[PDB]
Symmetry: C2
Subunit: 584 residues, 2 copies
């Protein structure tokens, strides 16, 4: 039994352009749920007062993205005329796998470096999705479509992974089952690494129809997590992805770590009284099992990212289920919160959004609030119980060894179609340098700088990790067609340059830019002596003179920058994407 | 290392009411693909030749069932009004899980013994979200997950339930994941399977725009006219558990999933292209953990896709895997189930598996149809593989150079590029037990008229002898412990296989209370349940009833509903299971209003 390290993350959630700004909304508790946009359907096309007609609901609104209908087709070697015929589900994931790629800090050449096996060394893809909405395609109009397995299968095809690719389905906890199966696929050693994730979108009113006939939603149309007005919940859209691999190799091939999936668990509810009822006895049977193989006490755990459904039946049952698990051997106080309060009920991205929240709570060392918990349903009799609802933003402290310990936190998600799953996460404890950067065309060049600027503006890193930032952009970013690099030793000389690109195209001797000229590729690669000259270029370390050749395309084996050890990775902004609409 | 034993099977495929008659069609090569029925869509409105038209399509007969549309709602405690909001995908599986239950001779009594059962089905939700459209539901046919999740809810399993998706090999991925979930020991047992149905013309529209199908509209597996393929419907299910326990709790074995493998095909030149290099990377890995030589293998149930690109690539991929060891003539047999039935888009590994297991039981090698002439790119005279033209006896390879068991591979490869290969071996009955003279054939059902059939289907089996006198105690034992004690009832006394039929014909025949018939109901006799169960002495009387073994006197009390612990004294070794006909289902229609 081996731990799994999570090295790369990304995702797109209501009122969140990137993870940076998602955390903002969680930390400043901000209701991200908003009115139905004009671009989707005729808002004013039919809606109903509470529980009356056949054809409509009291569908107030829900969590949505500005992003949804856009893609950069030609980036992935896909033609625009085939982009017309594609699923928002599939792009959003592809795009957000590729951001996870680079937030982890690994190239598409990832696959050749691991094994002399054969083409593109195995990588798993596990995503858990729903009904696509564009099958509702003019069904009166011939669609010039249908598969939930094309999501993972394109992602593997495009990037060239030789590892399992599939689309799971468990009603709510699909994302988290993927987590489970990914982790399962790693311990036994069938695959090296995995892209686990979940995707959810709200595109036809059939989603909003079906959800209202079976009364799962509230009149208010908000997520009240453990609140007093505990009536039903709203459907937030969402998409997310994470990159997983064993701790065993995460140390050697220094990789940047977000957290450790130390325990995984999943089961079904046996026969409940109704179809869509959850069984509290069944819920601890997961969580006991999550903590069994994790080998960590219930008294270690300091936070539970609950599947806060918010229904009158659902939330009390969860709390009672959580109680039974923790009451077997101890009676520290654990914090309970929900991401599902801030964003909506990711239908299939429930676990991944929660996971994302959990991991964002780890990096900034803080406990974010569960919104709409001002007053608590009288059936929350917190009855000598370890749990407590997390009202507000406070600093996260580590429990002590004295009571006779690392940060430890659980993650729940439970299907209406009874499938229950729980995951348990723990936190892991001069020279001039070459800032090289690349893209596919002209105009995406000083956005890619602009986004690196706006990070260094806010000051997310200090001077100490300059070699780390450089190293990433060299080996763990793709050497694309258009190029740019710069020379630094610095704190301040980073921004002195970046602002000059935003300011204009002006040329001080600090800029090197190029593409192109093919005399040299065949000259440079198939020869032993010119590689000794690149070896001999590092010996001296005169910087500017080589970077002229990089921007003109010199491919080079970067691993020769090395002190006797190569410094570990870092979270840098992923490639910003094009804004071309595709629909109908 | 844990082998997985496969103990129960079932499925429903084109022109196949049950597995018995599915084998018939495979053995007598039959072409099970037929013209589009009148009940579905009017197709004098969508038929063209290859055209530049708005999308009207050419690819228009395929493999279909007789009443995909029916269900027995109340059997499973589900109301008819919520069976009007229904997915054919979900019923067909439930129904076929429940047949797999009883063919593997266990029942819903699973969890009263132990103190978790896995469900893995791989589907393709297509159709009623469209039918639902200009004036269906979310957990009621708006989800593929509902398929597995109801099966677990209804029967009351506490083990993983899910709907996977890999374009073609979904069923076979389920096989893989089920088997994976058993070795590590997160779950006791699994229901692996696949379900596929063809209900809207959108399926038939999308398959024709992207030209996957043929003009002729048949499955030429490795044939000359290698053009494109057809979509056969299908549904299937199998029950899996470790060999470790399969001996101890004596269960009926069909075969052994000794090896499992799966991967993706990397970057190919096109999207829907398969990579031959990628194909042996599965099969090598299937044979790696199986620990069996390529030279042991005597049959490959191929993914015979039949396309001009697909079949040669497979053959070349298969070659590379086996060519690590030596090449020889007529070394391995290749065939397809796909030829006989259509492309079961999801159930394309489960149908193959089913064929493979049917080939094992009857010891024969069924034909690959439409292989009269072979695509010139099958240049096989330096390879081990050979296309299986006709029905011949399956022989075991030999072991004296210095019995090797029957060993056979099973392939399925996605057009969305997921590839998977499973390796199956037959179990040998290993050697080198008293019920008394009379035995209790008990049988049960939920209402009056189904008891007229439950017997009739057991009759028609014994008519065509299934087997002989020797396993009478086995047949009895099954119907006692591994069949549900339903509301309406019937039993009989026998000491031979001949007085079995002399009774069964009398039920189907004119009126007779001649031989000892015993019939009754649980519904009539109240206040014996509470009298019988909560007491130590009357259990000693049932104990003392076995001591003597006078038969007829107890069976009066069974039909009146006496629940009883049928570990009767079985000498403290109870004889193993047997394949008996599962509960025949009601014929009520459910679609549209």
């Amino acid at each position: 039994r081996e731990d799994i390290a999570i090295i790369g993350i990304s995702g797109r959630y209501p009122q969140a352009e990137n993870l940076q700004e998602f955390w903002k909304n969680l930390s400043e508790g901000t209701d991200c749920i908003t009115e139905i946009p004009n671009d989707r359907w005729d808002h004013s096309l039919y809606y109903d007062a509470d529980k009356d007609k056949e054809g409509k609901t009291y569908g107030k609104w829900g969590g949505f993205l500005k992003d949804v209908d856009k893609f950069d087709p030609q980036f992935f070697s896909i033609s625009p005329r085939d982009a017309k015929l594609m699923d928002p589900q599939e792009r959003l994931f592809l795009q957000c796998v590729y951001e996870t790629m680079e937030d982890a800090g690994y190239t598409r050449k990832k696959l050749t470096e691991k094994s002399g096996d054969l083409l593109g060394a195995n990588v798993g893809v596990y995503v858990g999705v729903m009904y696509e909405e564009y099958q509702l395609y003019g069904a009166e109009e011939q669609a010039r479509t249908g598969n939930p397995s094309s999501i993972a299968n394109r992602a593997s095809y495009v990037f060239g992974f030789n590892g399992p690719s599939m689309a799971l389905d468990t009603m709510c906890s699909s994302s988290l089952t993927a987590i489970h199966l990914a982790c399962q696929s790693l311990r036994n050693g069938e695959c090296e690494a995995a892209f686990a994730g979940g995707v959810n979108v709200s595109v036809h009113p059939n989603k909003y129809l079906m959800l209202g006939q079976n009364r799962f939603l509230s009149s208010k149309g908000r997520c009240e997590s453990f609140g007093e007005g505990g009536d039903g919940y709203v459907p937030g859209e969402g998409v997310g992805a994470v990159l997983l691999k064993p701790l065993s190799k995460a140390k050697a091939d220094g990789d940047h770590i977000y957290g450790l999936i130390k325990g995984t668990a999943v089961n079904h509810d046996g026969k409940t009284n109704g179809y869509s009822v959850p069984n509290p006895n069944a819920q601890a049977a997961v969580i006991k099992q999550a903590l069994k193989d994790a080998g960590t006490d219930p008294r270690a755990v300091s936070y539970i990212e609950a599947h806060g459904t918010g229904t009158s039946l659902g939330d009390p049952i969860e709390i009672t289920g959580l109680t039974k698990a923790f009451s077997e051997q101890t009676q520290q106080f654990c914090a309970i919160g929900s991401a599902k309060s801030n964003i909506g009920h990711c239908e299939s991205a429930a676990g991944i959004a929660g996971l994302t929240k959990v991991l964002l709570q780890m990096k900034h060392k803080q406990l974010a609030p569960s919104l709409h918990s001002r007053t608590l349903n009288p059936n929350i009799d917190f009855l000598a119980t370890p749990f407590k609802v997390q009202q507000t933003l406070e600093e996260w402290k580590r429990p002590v060894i004295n009571e006779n310990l690392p940060r430890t936190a659980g993650l729940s998600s439970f299907g209406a179609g009874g499938v229950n799953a729980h995951i348990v996460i723990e936190e892991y404890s001069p020279h001039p340098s070459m800032i090289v950067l690349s893209a596919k065309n002209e105009q995406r060049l000083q956005k890619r700088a602009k986004r690196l600027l706006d990070a260094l503006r806010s000051g997310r890193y200090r001077e100490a990790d300059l070699s780390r930032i450089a190293y990433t952009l060299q080996v763990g970013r793709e050497p694309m067609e258009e190029r740019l690099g710069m020379i630094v030793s610095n704190l301040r000389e980073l921004e002195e340059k970046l602002d000059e690109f935003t300011g204009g195209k002006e040329s001080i001797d600090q800029l090197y830019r190029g593409q192109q000229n093919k005399d040299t590729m065949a000259l440079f690669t198939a020869d032993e002596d010119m590689e000794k000259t690149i070896e001999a270029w590092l010996e001296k370390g005169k910087a500017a003179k080589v970077l002229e050749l990089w921007v003109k395309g010199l491919p080079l084996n970067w691993d020769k920058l090395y002190q006797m050890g190569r410094p570990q990775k870092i979270s840098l902004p992923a490639y910003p994407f094009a804004k071309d609409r595709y629909w109908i």
